[PDB]
Amino acid sequence: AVMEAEYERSEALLANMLPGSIAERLKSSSRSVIADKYDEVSVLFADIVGFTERASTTTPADLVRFLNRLYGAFDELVDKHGLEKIKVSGDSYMVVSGVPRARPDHAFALADFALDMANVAAALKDPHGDPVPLRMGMACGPVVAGVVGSRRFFYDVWGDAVNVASRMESTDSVGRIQVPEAMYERLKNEFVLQERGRIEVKGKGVMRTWYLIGRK
Ligand X SMILES: CNc1ccccc1C(=O)O[C@H]1[C@@H](O)[C@H](n2cnc3c(=O)[nH]c(N)nc32)O[C@@H]1COP(=O)(O)OP(=O)(O)OP(=O)(O)O
By the rule CB under 8 A, 85 interacts with a copy of itself: yes
**HSE-up (13 A, CA, CB side) for residue 90:** 6
By the rule CB under 5 A, 51 interacts with Mn ion: yes
| d(C-alpha 178, C-alpha 11), whole Å | 38
By the rule CB under 8 A, 205 interacts with a copy of itself: no
| d(C-alpha 132, C-alpha 58), whole Å | 14
Nearest of 214, 186, 164, 203 to residue 43 by alpha carbon: 164
* Contact letters for a copy of itself, residues 45-84 (x by CB under 8 A): ------xxx-x----xxxxxx-xx--xx-xxx-xx-----
| d(C-alpha 99, C-alpha 84), whole Å | 7
Q: Which residues contact 181 (CB under 8 A, 6 or more apart)?
A: 207, 208, 209, 210
Binding residues for a copy of itself restricted to 154-183, rule: CB under 8 A: 154-156, 158-160, 162-163
By the rule CB under 8 A, 148 interacts with a copy of itself: yes
- Name which of 7 and 158 has its Cβ closer to Mn ion: 158
Among 17, 64, 206, 213, binds ligand X (CB under 6 A): 64
By the rule CB under 5 A, 163 interacts with Mn ion: no
- Name which of 170 and 193 has its Cβ closer to a copy of itself: 170
* Contact letters for ligand X, residues 138-177 (x by CB under 6 A): ------x-----------xxxxx-xx--x-----------
Task: Determine the residue type at 23.
Answer: A
Binding site for a copy of itself (CB under 8 A): 3-4, 6-7, 9-11, 13-14, 16-18, 23, 26-27, 33-37, 51-53, 55, 60-65, 67-68, 71-72, 74-76, 78-79, 85-90, 142-144, 146-156, 158-160, 162-163, 202-204
